[PDB]
Design a protein around this ligand. Structure first.
Ligand SMILES: *[C@@H]1O[C@H](CO)[C@@H](O[C@@H]2O[C@H](CO)[C@@H](O[C@@H]3O[C@H](CO[C@H]4O[C@H](CO[C@H]5O[C@H](CO)[C@@H](O)[C@H](O)[C@@H]5O[C@H]5O[C@H](CO)[C@@H](O)[C@H](O)[C@@H]5O)[C@@H](O)[C@H](O[C@H]5O[C@H](CO)[C@@H](O)[C@H](O)[C@@H]5O)[C@@H]4O)[C@@H](O)[C@H](O[C@H]4O[C@H](CO)[C@@H](O)[C@H](O)[C@@H]4O[C@H]4O[C@H](CO)[C@@H](O)[C@H](O)[C@@H]4O)[C@@H]3O)[C@H](O)[C@H]2NC(C)=O)[C@H](O)[C@H]1NC(C)=O
Ligand SMILES: *[C@@H]1O[C@H](CO)[C@@H](O[C@@H]2O[C@H](CO)[C@@H](O[C@@H]3O[C@H](CO[C@H]4O[C@H](CO[C@H]5O[C@H](CO)[C@@H](O)[C@H](O)[C@@H]5O[C@H]5O[C@H](CO)[C@@H](O)[C@H](O)[C@@H]5O)[C@@H](O)[C@H](O[C@H]5O[C@H](CO)[C@@H](O)[C@H](O)[C@@H]5O)[C@@H]4O)[C@@H](O)[C@H](O[C@H]4O[C@H](CO)[C@@H](O)[C@H](O)[C@@H]4O[C@H]4O[C@H](CO)[C@@H](O)[C@H](O)[C@@H]4O)[C@@H]3O)[C@H](O)[C@H]2NC(C)=O)[C@H](O)[C@H]1NC(C)=O
Ligand SMILES: *[C@@H]1O[C@H](CO)[C@@H](O[C@@H]2O[C@H](CO)[C@@H](O[C@@H]3O[C@H](CO[C@H]4O[C@H](CO)[C@@H](O)[C@H](O[C@H]5O[C@H](CO)[C@@H](O)[C@H](O)[C@@H]5O)[C@@H]4O)[C@@H](O)[C@H](O[C@H]4O[C@H](CO)[C@@H](O)[C@H](O)[C@@H]4O)[C@@H]3O)[C@H](O)[C@H]2NC(C)=O)[C@H](O)[C@H]1NC(C)=O
Ligand SMILES: *[C@@H]1O[C@H](CO)[C@@H](O[C@@H]2O[C@H](CO)[C@@H](O[C@@H]3O[C@H](CO[C@H]4O[C@H](CO)[C@@H](O)[C@H](O[C@H]5O[C@H](CO)[C@@H](O)[C@H](O)[C@@H]5O)[C@@H]4O)[C@@H](O)[C@H](O[C@H]4O[C@H](CO)[C@@H](O)[C@H](O)[C@@H]4O)[C@@H]3O)[C@H](O)[C@H]2NC(C)=O)[C@H](O)[C@H]1NC(C)=O
Ligand SMILES: OC[C@H]1O[C@@](CO)(OC[C@H]2O[C@H](O[C@]3(CO)O[C@H](CO)[C@@H](O)[C@@H]3O)[C@H](O)[C@@H](O)[C@@H]2O)[C@@H](O)[C@@H]1O
Ligand SMILES: OC[C@H]1O[C@@](CO)(OC[C@H]2O[C@H](O[C@]3(CO)O[C@H](CO)[C@@H](O)[C@@H]3O)[C@H](O)[C@@H](O)[C@@H]2O)[C@@H](O)[C@@H]1O
Ligand SMILES: *[C@@H]1O[C@H](CO)[C@@H](O)[C@H](O)[C@H]1NC(C)=O
Ligand SMILES: *[C@@H]1O[C@H](CO)[C@@H](O)[C@H](O)[C@H]1NC(C)=O
Ligand SMILES: *[C@@H]1O[C@H](CO)[C@@H](O)[C@H](O)[C@H]1NC(C)=O
Ligand SMILES: *[C@@H]1O[C@H](CO)[C@@H](O)[C@H](O)[C@H]1NC(C)=O
Ligand SMILES: *[C@@H]1O[C@H](CO)[C@@H](O)[C@H](O)[C@H]1NC(C)=O
Ligand SMILES: *[C@@H]1O[C@H](CO)[C@@H](O)[C@H](O)[C@H]1NC(C)=O
Ligand SMILES: *[C@@H]1O[C@H](CO)[C@@H](O)[C@H](O)[C@H]1NC(C)=O
Ligand SMILES: *[C@@H]1O[C@H](CO)[C@@H](O)[C@H](O)[C@H]1NC(C)=O
Ligand SMILES: *[C@@H]1O[C@H](CO)[C@@H](O)[C@H](O)[C@H]1NC(C)=O
Ligand SMILES: *[C@@H]1O[C@H](CO)[C@@H](O)[C@H](O)[C@H]1NC(C)=O
Ligand SMILES: *[C@@H]1O[C@H](CO)[C@@H](O)[C@H](O)[C@H]1NC(C)=O
Ligand SMILES: *[C@@H]1O[C@H](CO)[C@@H](O)[C@H](O)[C@H]1NC(C)=O
Ligand SMILES: *[C@@H]1O[C@H](CO)[C@@H](O)[C@H](O)[C@H]1NC(C)=O
Ligand SMILES: *[C@@H]1O[C@H](CO)[C@@H](O)[C@H](O)[C@H]1NC(C)=O
Ligand SMILES: *[C@@H]1O[C@H](CO)[C@@H](O)[C@H](O)[C@H]1NC(C)=O
Lengths: 624, 624
């Protein structure tokens, strides 16, 4: 094992555990100190204003198992500090018959048991568990724990009748899944159900969804309501909130609803952020966010989706959320998006970016797997004065259209996503910022044109506005993590409406994924404009490439170039001519970003361990 | 629910939880503070000379589940004090994937991990578990924990490769069971194996047996040897130590070997007590004690047995224990005998006495189930100058015979058992003792003759020597827990050699067991004697009746009379005439015994709880 990054990579599978720990590792985002991580969980803003973030964690292993909550906190979403207690950075772990198989995803009741922050989480025990297996009742239940020390530790309620687990009965038979309880308050849903509370007797101020589905018959999001305000044991099943069909797809802009939902949440937004009205705000829109499984051929069979919904009240005192339009939260290698309320009428969403090493070839050499996305403000994106001649506009696939009275313009509404401003400010202010001169891409443009200032390492952001003619067939974008031999190309092709990440040359190491990422991006053309504009922001952070377009479209992916000098960046141009010209302005390079974990040394590995021969005997965890 | 014990019992199933807590409860013996208990475990003499006793425990329930070690200590086997920590009187409990289904029986390595007392115990996880089920590897494993505070708490080794569990591979396929590790030192076995240690490489000073069997093919006791002295992770399987056949019986004096062994131990004794020689002591005998299951129609299908064995060394460096003769440790409602070494060359044995309420009709009303037997010194019982005309003597069923050179007398050898003298001294000294005049039972004897002094409650001991003619057909014994309407009759019938406990009138409450208990007792006739003698000692302790004959035969049973005045006692006579006379001498009543738990109040119930609907979902524990 040579770690010489000035020459071609050898056989890296000969390298020891965690010898590649720092080589590809993100520095500017939320990531566990070491080992395996997946879904964000237990997210809440604490009483002091700081953010508590939990995550599914398996320390000292590089595959999933004994799944626990690791945790950390931040005052600005950006610079983090690990909790440190008797179990290191873990704060909840398998410990009881009801959760011994894993402490799965959960969410926070801010004023819960004895007034303390309280987590409702999926407690798992033994038996087949999975959407393609024959799971039985009891294998997944829902349990409570509360914290008296602001998340340093959690106390579970006792096991038994009238205690944990608090939700255990399956609401319908033959479930594909029964997990990821999302607890939320909703003046909207309270108003809608106020005339039906005699039917159900459920009058609490908290609702909870549980994500699942029914074998052979598609996904389900089940709605529960807290039975009585101030009491947390009794949750009353109302009915299915979202019901989709077996591998149903709403279309090309909407992924696929698969067979089973995971990590679903419910929110209400308006153009400024989170909306807490009862229905009276006509600018507010109800949204569900959810993962689906087994409706996709790649990306671990996983789509992270969202849908705008219209609530209808059923006669039995339950709610049907009818999908009005349906989109994708991120088009790349990310999943398990969670959202939570933040002071100042915000709803903030964050997900998990998995690696691109699905055959587990270099995982042990890394000594870790996974990171978060950036934290994103959600809001209702409104585009005014849209031209009716925008191609495909009236499909209304992942957006809605409202015509003006005279029919000459359209108002477009969709889900907006943008990186939280605290992170953008910290990134820019801690970086060496190069404001770049605008560039006209025409007949003279090379395929690749390096920026006049270059990054110094694998931690940088790029921004640019690409102005295209309305009938262009040119392509343009950004190349990143680039030397002569390795590079990753981010292209937008307005003619096809496809944003792609071409990764055929991303790395000389052949074991990593190299498939082309793809997102659909609708350039809403403005009345009177003779051009259309793509605003692209790209974060490069170790191996993470995270792309944002027009505060709407997100695509997270991975690139693992070996060579030390595969850090460059610049503009891409294809089919630009004297007549078909792409104007690039607002160009900026932010070199360095922020050290997100200032108290951590560069190498936080503690080595890896094997569970031994009993792992295969129990059959629950891989063991490493 | 009336608790009026001056009138007939009502419907006691209407009574609340623990309303009958003190009614039938032993006071003078080891018993949990409340709830369910079964097998003794973790027995050892601590560095200060006191005795640590653990037991299988399920607090606040009256059926088995979440099985844990409860613990207490004593300086004299007799007066006890509970441990009190964060889990009350528990000191080890299910907490890891490998033991979450129950912390089963274990035994003590006195100088173990870092020099501390260390327990090797059966750690259980999920799956079918039982001799009549299709158990698989991993469901029962063996794990270590050690104590730095003399048994107040235990620290388990970590889960994983080279740590817990330390024994997990099945030594043969299709096991009926794989549990109850018994760790012991043996100069005897070390001497026997010293020429074979090149074959196995196992040279440690500790051995361990694991109890089990093979489906369709009888019970097995598997022998392991510590691989290296001073190291406790690696245990090397040598081979089967004891192999018996599917429901094989050695005869009427020997119970039945069933299909599977439980709680087996290995010891070496001589006439004084424990023997620690290498083979050189010609008076010493090797013994195995073991429970068997499914070889008995009643008594929960359980025989607590023992066998004298002769060790043979196999060519592969293992030991075969060939059964020389085979007996019964207790003939009544007891099981799960454990033995442990005690200072002064002693080996002390104690078991579990279950209730006689197998349909669980009044268990909740009790608020507890189970107690220990008394603690018993084991030794080699030697009877000299036995007459060759003793009937059945040369069957050598649960004893051995050695003829004198001239053939006119025999030396008989068997397992001796007697109550530890610390308990006998404390019982007598704290009791009101009535020394009773001898009684000749002849033609004038009533069926029942009350003693001239009577007990004052349900806590007393009786002793007597019954002298019978060599060809008697008379029966005699003791009646206990007696009023006019309820009583329990203990008979010996020398003609049949049967000691019985007749319980048809033991209680007016009909739900309790009433079957007749039976033990075989061999009166070894002495050369020149014109009579034969049965020395009988009976302990009455709440509902426990514990009978000892000739420091050899033990029979533990239960009686639950309702009436407050069912406490009397006296002599029984049947078929005694002018010519067939039974002489009773050495008669003593000890009224009161000892309060074994002086710090406990009379009612130590903490109520009972239900596990809720998930108990049936998990399918592991009854839930109550
Ligand atoms: C199989 O058996 C298992 C073992 O018995 C069983 O698990 C046990 O279940 C019981 C009953 O449900 C649990 O008991 C509850 O404990 C809660 C507190 O839990 C937290 O604190 C525990 C003890 O605290 C100390 O001891 C530790 C060990 O030494 C130290 O680390 C601590 O520093 C602390 O020490 C201090 O106190 C010591 C004495 O206790 C003292 O010596 C010392 O000097 C020092 O001062 C921890 O053990 C526990 O940790 C476990 O659980 C957490 C998750 O919760 C895990 O992360 C850990 O790994 C570990 O497994 C916790 O940190 C109590 O609050 C709770 O009390 C109340 O509830 C009951 C019934 O509802 C009431 O009777 C009672 O009044 C209390 O209610 C009142 O208070 C609350 C608010 O205060 C209020 O809301 C309520 O209305 C009311 O007013 C109860 O005692 C026990 O924790 C479990 N143990 C373990 C190890 O798991 C298991 O379930 C069984 N399984 C089956 C299937 O049956
Ligand atoms: C799923 O995840 C699970 C959670 O992570 C995981 O379980 C955990 O496994 C790890 C690794 O095996 C265990 O860690 C070991 O812990 C041993 C000590 O255990 C005992 O003490 C623990 C911590 O002590 C404190 O904290 C408590 C909680 O607040 C308090 O109650 C105590 O008072 C005490 O507080 C003091 O210390 C605090 C900081 O620690 C401090 O803040 C505070 O102020 C105060 O001063 C207890 O948590 C633990 O209790 C658990 O386990 C017992 C049974 O053991 C149960 O009865 C309990 O209910 C509970 O579940 C124990 O009481 C360590 O000795 C051990 O250390 C060593 O071994 C490793 C590796 O071999 C070495 O790296 C290290 O150097 C140590 O070795 C050295 O020392 C020893 C002798 O000292 C020597 O022999 C050796 O050669 C060497 O020199 C290790 O850290 C952890 O306990 C597990 N936790 C739980 C909750 O279960 C689980 O396995 C996972 N499952 C799967 C399938 O993967
Ligand atoms: C006395 O001790 C017992 C513990 O043994 C305490 O708890 C009770 O235990 C018994 C088991 O011994 C439980 O009986 C079972 O009950 C279920 C159905 O229960 C439902 O209906 C009840 C009646 O109104 C109700 O009390 C229950 O409510 C509790 O549980 C729910 C969770 O489900 C919880 O939300 C509540 O807060 C309560 O905790 C519940 O809704 C029944 O299905 C069982 O049937 C089996 O057994 C019977 C009898 O052998 C048999 O007929 C059936 O065929 C089947 O095999 C079983 O009867 C009882 O529910 C427990 N009660 C509780 C928890 O309150 C009890 O509290 C102690 N008493 C006191 C005064 O302390
Ligand atoms: C680096 O990180 C790893 C953790 O990932 C550390 O532990 C090793 O993990 C790997 C899994 O990643 C283990 O590999 C498996 O090994 C078993 C067979 O193992 C036996 O033989 C080994 C070789 O000499 C020996 O080391 C083992 O000894 C350990 O375990 C026993 C308990 O069984 C214990 O008593 C000892 O004390 C040791 O702890 C053991 O006897 C093999 O069956 C597995 O095969 C599967 O996977 C492979 C590869 O994909 C595949 O080919 C097979 O078909 C099958 O699917 C697997 O290879 C390895 O045993 C672990 N080693 C340990 C515990 O020492 C490792 O230590 C870290 N290194 C450093 C330097 O820190
Ligand atoms: O990487 C997930 C691994 O967990 C396993 C164990 O069977 O399956 C469980 C479950 O995990 C994933 O679910 C989520 C969101 O992805 O993660 C947590 C569990 O950590 C759970 O609360 C969430 O729903 C996965 O998406 C599911 O499909 C899996 O069924 C492994 O099979 C799997 O590799
Ligand atoms: O009363 C025992 C109850 O435990 C259960 C659970 O399946 O079975 C396990 C096992 O228990 C008994 O085994 C012993 C000695 O009797 O007790 C401990 C477990 O507490 C174990 O280490 C000992 O071997 C019982 O004799 C076995 O037959 C059972 O298989 C219940 O089924 C059972 O009622
Ligand atoms: C990068 O490094 C490689 C090998 O070390 C070298 O061949 C190449 O010339 C360097 N520079 C660029 C821009 O590729
Ligand atoms: C990181 O630390 C681990 C554990 O100490 C060590 O095994 C590994 O070799 C280190 N890796 C690097 C790149 O320093
Ligand atoms: C309410 O009605 C819906 C639609 O039929 C149904 O799916 C749901 O199960 C009902 N709620 C109940 C039975 O609580
Ligand atoms: C919306 O506007 C377009 C173009 O003016 C027209 O084709 C369509 O019919 C309009 N829809 C409604 C509801 O008026
Ligand atoms: C650098 O980043 C830190 C951590 O997020 C932030 O608090 C600080 O304001 C930043 N510095 C700037 C913007 O100059
Ligand atoms: C074509 O592009 C080059 C490079 O941006 C620029 O120098 C030139 O002005 C452009 N041509 C026209 C006609 O604008
Ligand atoms: C654009 O994307 C779609 C997938 O939505 C794909 O079918 C099509 O081939 C792509 N076209 C081009 C030219 O990239
Ligand atoms: C015992 O009590 C019962 C009922 O209280 C009574 O009938 C009987 O006479 C009493 N005495 C005896 C010795 O049975
Ligand atoms: C014993 O205590 C328990 C729990 O407090 C109580 O329920 C029960 O009625 C008491 N029984 C007696 C006989 O005092
Ligand atoms: C017997 O053993 C084998 C594994 O050695 C296993 O496949 C089989 O299921 C076991 N049980 C029976 C009933 O054959
Ligand atoms: C040693 O021989 C015995 C008798 O054949 C056998 O049962 C045992 O399994 C052998 N020991 C091994 C293979 O370790
Ligand atoms: C033992 O003694 C009896 C009676 O003297 C006799 O029947 C038997 O043969 C003797 N056994 C031996 C081995 O001498
Ligand atoms: C009474 O019993 C206690 C506890 O076992 C014992 O220590 C004491 O010696 C006894 N009293 C006597 C024999 O007088
Ligand atoms: C018969 O028994 C009675 C009672 O023990 C006694 O008084 C009498 O002496 C006995 N008869 C003879 C002949 O010993
Ligand atoms: C004595 O006990 C045996 C059981 O070993 C039994 O078969 C026999 O019937 C009993 N005989 C009498 C008279 O009690």
């Amino acid at each position: 094992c040579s770690l010489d990054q000035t020459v071609a990579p050898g056989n890296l599978t000969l390298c020891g555990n965690a010898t590649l720990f720092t080589t590809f590792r993100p520095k500017a985002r939320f990531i566990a100190p070491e080992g395996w991580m997946n879904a964000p969980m237990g997210l809440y803003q604490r009483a002091d204003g700081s953010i508590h973030a939990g995550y599914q964690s398996h320390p000292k292993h590089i595959q999933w198992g004994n799944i626990s909550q690791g945790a950390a906190y931040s005052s600005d979403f950006t610079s983090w500090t690990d909790f440190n207690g008797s179990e290191g950075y873990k704060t909840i772990w398998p410990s009881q018959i009801y959760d011994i198989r894993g402490v799965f995803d959960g969410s926070i009741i801010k004023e819960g048991i004895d007034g303390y922050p309280t987590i409702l989480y999926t407690s798992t025990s033994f038996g087949p568990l999975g959407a393609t297996l024959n799971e039985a009742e009891g294998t997944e239940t829902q349990s409570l724990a509360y914290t008296t020390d602001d998340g340093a530790s959690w106390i579970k309620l006792g096991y038994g009748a009238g205690q944990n687990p608090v939700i255990y009965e399956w609401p319908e038979t033959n479930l594909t899944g029964f997990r990821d309880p999302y607890v939320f308050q909703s003046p909207r849903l309270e108003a809608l159900l106020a005339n039906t509370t005699s039917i159900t007797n459920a009058t609490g101020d908290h609702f909870a969804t549980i994500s699942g589905g029914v074998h052979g018959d598609g996904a389900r999001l089940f709605l529960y309501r807290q039975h009585t305000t101030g009491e947390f044991i009794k949750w009353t099943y109302l009915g299915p909130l979202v019901t989709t069909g077996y591998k149903e797809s709403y279309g090309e802009w909407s992924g696929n609803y698969g067979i089973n939902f995971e990590t679903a949440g419910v929110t209400r937004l308006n153009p400024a952020g989170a909306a807490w009205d009862n229905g009276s705000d006509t600018t507010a829109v109800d949204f569900v966010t959810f993962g689906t499984e087994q409706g996709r051929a790649d990306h671990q069979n996983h789509w992270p989706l969202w849908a705008a919904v219209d609530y209808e009240v059923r006669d039995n005192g339950s709610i049907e959320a009818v999908i009005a339009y349906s989109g994708v939260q991120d088009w790349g290698r990310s999943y398990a998006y969670a959202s939570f309320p933040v002071e100042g009428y915000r709803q903030v969403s964050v997900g998990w970016i998995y690696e691109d090493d699905d055959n587990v070839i270099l995982a042990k050499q890394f000594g870790y797997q996974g990171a978060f996305t950036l934290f994103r403000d959600l809001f209702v994106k409104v585009v005014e004065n849209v031209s009716p001649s925008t191609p495909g506009l009236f499909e209304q696939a992942s957006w809605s259209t409202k015509n003006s009275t005279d029919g000459m313009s359209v108002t477009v509404t969709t889900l907006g996503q943008r990186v939280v401003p605290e992170t953008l400010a910290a990134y820019k202010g801690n970086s060496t910022v190069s404001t770049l001169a605008p560039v006209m891409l025409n007949e003279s443009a090379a395929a690749y044109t390096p920026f006049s200032s270059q990054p110094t390492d694998r931690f940088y952001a790029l921004t640019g506005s690409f102005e295209f003619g309305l009938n262009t067939t040119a392509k343009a974008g950004f190349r990143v993590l680039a030397s002569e031999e390795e590079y990753t190309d981010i292209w937008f092709d307005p003619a096809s409406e496809n944003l792609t990440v071409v990764r055929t040359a991303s790395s000389l190491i052949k074991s990593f994924g190299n498939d082309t990422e793809l997102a659909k991006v609708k350039l809403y053309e403005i009345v009177g404009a003779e051009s259309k504009t793509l605003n692209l922001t790209v974060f490069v952070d170790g191996s993470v490439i995270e792309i944002y377009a027009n505060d709407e479209v997100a695509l997270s992916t991975r690139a693992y170039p070996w060579l030390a000098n595969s850090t460059g960046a610049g503009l891409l141009a294809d089919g630009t001519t004297a007549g078909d010209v792409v104007g690039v302005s607002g160009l900026e390079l932010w070199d360095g970003l922020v050290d997100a974990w200032p108290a951590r040394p560069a190498n936080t590995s503690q080595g890896l361990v094997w569970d031994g021969p009993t792992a295969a005997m129990y059959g629950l965890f891989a063991g490493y």
